[PDB]
Specification:
The PDB classes it as transport protein. The entry lists the keywords CLC, transporter, transport protein. 2 copies of one chain form a homodimer. In chain A, 62% of the residues lie in helices and 6% in strands. Chain A is mostly helical and 534 residues long. Chain A has 2 domains: 408 residues, Clc chloride channel (Orthogonal Bundle); 126 residues, Roll (CBS-domain). In chain A, the strands form 3 sheets. Chain A has a 3-stranded mixed sheet. Chain A has a two-stranded antiparallel ribbon with strand order 2-8. Chain A has a two-stranded antiparallel ribbon with strand order 3-4. In chain A, helix 7 runs parallel beside helix 9 and helix 12 runs parallel beside helix 14. Strand 1 of chain A pairs antiparallel with strand 1 of chain B, so a sheet runs across the interface. The structure holds chloride ion (4 copies). The site of one chloride ion has 5 residues of chain A, from loops.
């Protein structure tokens, strides 16, 4: 009752601190690696001082993809998608991505990616870090139970996400709120205090405008921005999947290197610096966001650590400024172009991310929160509109990268299909009897290794359910039944539209199929969920 | 896929508008009924002018409890608790509370309760109203499906709650956020856009400070304030249940009338007026909150419409001023007593409510949001602290008023009890066979009216599951099987700690018990849930 609370409080505070502490050191290393890169250039002549900027830039992007390659390639990409996977009920399958060795390929990869001048964020990679740190704490005795308990692991790993995100924006509430909107499929309300706690912990560590209600024109920008967020997620997937289908098997540095070079040159006539400046209220700005629209969409498909929030913040603000200026003329001096860049930055990340929180994030960061209402409506419209065309950039990344993700159905399965159509016959799948002697049960045990549940039926087999390992292995250490596991059994005529639901809510690995009482078939979780596996 | 969205969008917008519109009329009717009451007094002499204030005050409190009595006594109390019940999976049981007649006893009762000078809020009653309005639209053809669909009814009735709350605070985000924290057990992330939409709609209708980081002392106030919130919920229940156990069956006006009179007198040496004043930073203030602490606790037990948010706002601010003054002297002029009243009002409502959102609500209302961090920590401590002693005032109210509420277990059932201990034997419960002729099935149908599912088994009965009414009644209109319903079946050794879970997540009315394959018993949802029913 109290040892319960103090255990949990201890964990979340020790997580939140060392999460926002680690991310501070990531940030600290990015601000140094950039200034090094700058010294190299200013020490040589002006002509060569420019090329030594580009050369150093490619080099650090090559070192970035190298870190992933030499340590853990599971550290490539955002990380949020890879996590959305785990919290979806595939912790047993994706447990590999949370290994300590992946923390290094993420945090070394990120420092070098942003260092080398890639148009690449840290929101994703950052959430990924926090989870691995939270997973390491799980290794201490006092905290091990926190992972064991299915329910308690969900809620804690979610707090890792919160502190991961909230540290990326330096906005504690903005963070936790964005967290529940994206990693979660559904959300246990209990966790909200656990996620806030772990976020404020890191805020304390890290402690060591006006938009007129001419809203109608803001909502018009909200609508358009949804359509542009749609196009963005559409671009990411299409630019990506034409590298896989066509020109496939291009390897690492030549790919990353071209984008690094191409980037440093495509930005010849041109981070948190630009933003605040468009937010100030005072040609060559038409190309700015359009170039970065393409450049970023391309870059997050790269085999290296890549977030998307701070980049999309720029792309929005830029479009918001182009709108805020094209409205400056049509409606008079009364229109302020600055406030349209604010609604712009918020609505576009809300187009691409689908997080209504981006409205709160822009407030918490530098925003004064004059009025949410205008910003909150245009952020919403962007979701409703972009929610029509596309799936969320994260969900699309899940498809795009082929990650087991419970809430999307297999491309090849109708919700009308009966469990019978997809179930795996019981004859080939392992099963146990009460009558089968100790001499028997050793057989299945070794011939089906890794099996944790054994379905137990009589002759003319009828349903029960015994464990494998805790009991059978320990009931063997003397030389059956009673059982200890209740499986979610389902009748053979129950269809996918309802198997899929049990998989998302109950989150099991297997569902038993009942035909007239007899155990006739198991349905794997791989049989319904859009799961890449591999 | 578009007719889907536009239907939903049309519903939420037409709900949100008319919800915040109806609540505006309630608010408008309270501001007049109070001014009438004031005219009556100032027309007579000064001596009598005071007694005519009290007499009018009692009268309107009597008329308040009368409205509930003469229309629908289901309109007594908060309403949120009554709703928390519905959204918990008891919509079929508590449907009566959403009847149109109950909207009148709610909104008339409330106008007269606050008019008569009761220390009584509108947050609860207000959420109740919005649901009944939402429920009425449900009757229109285009919207009826929105209620039919189990999942889509949840999400929309949740949006009623959001626009209900958000309007009660005039803080859209604060409202929807407080909503997910309290009505919901878990929360489908989909709804968040539906709730925001329905809230901003009513915001558009309704459109027609500094806390230093001396936070340590704010956290010490957060700690204490949780303990006071605990005592507050402890008081509500104990003052209530001593009226039921002792002096039981006291009826209506004498009860309501004594509290009306007693109140108007107990406040002899003393709403949104006081608040802003303590928030301004510039004996007889020690008694103020303590009197109202008792007075309010007592009043929300009364048989009439009674919210608790705005009253608790006062009680906190008061205690926060008492603290902010006792800190004024101990730490010097550098301490500002005003900002401690703000953290005070937020932390105490966060004590009683357990909503971390009160932090955001205080910001959104008049708050400028200088920094959340100090306020957001103290609001969280208050929850972690009061979360130790007590259950949330709403959950405690659910116990206190004996309402079916899925997530609390029956007072008399251990999670260790096997489903076999609690299951109802299948012989006494209705069942069907494939062999039983049309002459047979007419029997069960009429002798067990109101039955919707019929468990279907063979001779030596083995599990399947047929509907009752859609099929059997229509398959009778010609003079069996195949089945059309899949029931959540569970083995006889599966225990309550896991029946209870299935009831909360899957939200079914019944669970079938499997003993060696044979259907041996039904477990009603009334067998596990702490459900008073009646
Ligand atoms: Cl990715
Ligand atoms: Cl970022
Ligand atoms: Cl109540
Ligand atoms: Cl209120």
């Amino acid at each position: 009752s109290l040892m319960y609370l103090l255990r949990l409080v201890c964990f979340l505070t020790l997580l939140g601190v060392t999460a926002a502490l680690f991310i501070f050191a990531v940030d600290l290393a990015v601000h140094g690696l950039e200034e090094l890169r700058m010294k190299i250039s200013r020490l040589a002549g002006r002509f060569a001082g420019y090329i030594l900027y580009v050369v150093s830039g490619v080099a650090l992007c090559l070192l970035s993809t190298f870190w992933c390659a030499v340590l853990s390639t599971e550290a490539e990409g955002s990380g949020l998608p890879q996590m959305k996977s785990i919290l979806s009920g595939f912790y047993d399958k994706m447990r590999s991505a949370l290994e300590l060795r992946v923390l290094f390929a993420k945090a070394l990869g990120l420092i070098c990616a942003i260092g080398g001048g890639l148009p690449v964020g840290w929101e994703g990679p950052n959430v990924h870090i926090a989870c691995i740190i939270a997973h390491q704490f799980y290794r201490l005795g006092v905290f091990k139970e926190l992972c064991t308990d299915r329910a308690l692991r969900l809620q804690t790993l979610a707090a890792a996400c919160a502190v991961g995100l909230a540290s990326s924006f330096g906005a504690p509430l903005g963070g936790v709120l964005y967290s529940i909107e994206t990693i979660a499929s559904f959300y246990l309300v209990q966790a909200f205090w656990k996620g806030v706690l772990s976020a404020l912990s890191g805020a304390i560590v890290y402690e060591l405008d006006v938009s007129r209600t001419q809203t109608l024109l803001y909502a018009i920008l909200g609508a358009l921005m949804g359509v542009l967020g749609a196009l963005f997620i559409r671009c990411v997937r299409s630019i990506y999947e034409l590298r896989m289908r066509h020109y496939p098997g291009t390897n690492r540095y030549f790919l990353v290197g071209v984008v690094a070079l191409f980037a440093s040159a495509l930005q010849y006539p041109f981070p948190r610096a630009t933003i605040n400046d468009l937010f100030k209220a005072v040609t060559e700005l038409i190309l700015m966001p359009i170039i970065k629209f393409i450049l970023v969409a391309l870059s997050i498909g790269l085999p290296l650590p890549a977030g998307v929030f701070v980049p999309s913040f720029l792309i929005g603000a830029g479009f918001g400024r182009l709108y805020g200026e094209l409205m400056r003329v049509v409606f008079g001096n009364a229109i302020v172009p600055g406030s349209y860049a604010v609604v712009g930055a918020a609505a576009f990340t809300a187009g691409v991310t689908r997080a209504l929180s981006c409205a709160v994030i822009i407030f918490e960061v530098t925003g004064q929160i004059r009025h949410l209402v205008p910003v909150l409506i245009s952020v919403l419209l962007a979701v409703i509109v972009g929610n029509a065309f596309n799936r969320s950039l994260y969900e699309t990344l899940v498809l795009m990268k082929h990650l087991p993700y419970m809430p999307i159905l297999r491309r090849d399965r109708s919700p009308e299909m009966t469990a019978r159509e997809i179930m795996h016959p019981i004859e080939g799948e392992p099963h146990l009897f009460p009558d089968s002697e100790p001499q028997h049960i050793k057989g299945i045990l070794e011939k089906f290794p890794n099996r944790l549940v054994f379905p137990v039926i009589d002759a003319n087999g009828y349903l029960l359910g015994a464990i494998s390992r805790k009991e059978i292995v320990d009931r063997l250490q003397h030389v059956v039944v009673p059982c200890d596991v209740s499986p979610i059994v389902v009748t053979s005529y129950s269809l996918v539209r309802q198997l899929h639901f049990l998989f998302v809510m109950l989150m099991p690995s297997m569902i038993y199929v009942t035909e007239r009482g007899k155990l006739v078939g198991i349905v794997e979780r791989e049989d319904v969920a859009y799961g890449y596996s591999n």
